[PDB]
Amino acid sequence: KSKPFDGKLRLPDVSQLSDTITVSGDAAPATLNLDQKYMDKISCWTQTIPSHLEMSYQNL
């Protein structure tokens, strides 16, 4: 006994949230979050991607 689905996709505008919170609701890190688990392997470059490059790992 509830309203049936209208058939439209409703997505919130996450662009209006504060800068102190990430998309997932957790606290926003003010600095790069590096881990020793990944900085000793090929991932060291992934964690330090520069701001002038746009990389996609689905299409490489």
Partner: protein
């Protein structure tokens, strides 16, 4: 638009007007220091197992903050840009999308190109196959509504 929760407002151009002297008899511009910044370097990481140090150079380090966020936008945000552009190209121009998500125009166009290529792969049947098939979603542009956080606190309303 408050500095507490708007990093973009914090990283804004500054209007500098500094003087030395007496405004009633004679004044001169203060040119004894550089308030526009300079190139900086910083140590970011130290690996204790290999003894490797990482240093980061920034062109405008003294007049910017948290510049690492621009290139680390979530996948949800990128899909939202792709859907908004397809829904209404007349209103969602490159300028509007760049202002909305606090990024540069070059980044906006680059994101669209990569998402477009990925969509073709999904439609062609090269990605999201087998057990992961349900995660390939086809969306009609008409059946899309964007909610807003108008009410203070938790809750998204349609208008």
């Amino acid at each position: 638009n408050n500095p507490e929760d708007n990093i973009a407002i914090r990283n804004a151009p500054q209007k500098v007007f500094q003087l030395i002297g007496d405004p009633r008899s004679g004044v001169a511009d203060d040119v004894t220091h550089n308030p526009f910044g300079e190139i900086t370097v910083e140590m970011v990481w130290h690996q204790l197992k290999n003894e490797v140090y990482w240093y980061r150079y920034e062109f405008a380090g003294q007049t910017t903050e948290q510049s690492h966020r621009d290139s680390r936008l979530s996948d949800y945000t990128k899909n939202l840009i792709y859907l908004l552009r397809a829904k209404n190209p007349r209103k969602w121009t490159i300028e509007a999308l760049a202002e909305k998500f606090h990024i540069r125009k070059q980044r906006v166009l680059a994101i669209l190109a990569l998402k477009e290529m990925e969509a073709h792969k999904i439609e062609s049947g090269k990605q999201l196959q087998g057990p992961l098939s349900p995660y390939g979603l086809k969306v009609r542009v008409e059946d899309l509504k964007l909610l807003s956080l108008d009410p203070t606190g938790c809750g998204w309303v349609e208008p």
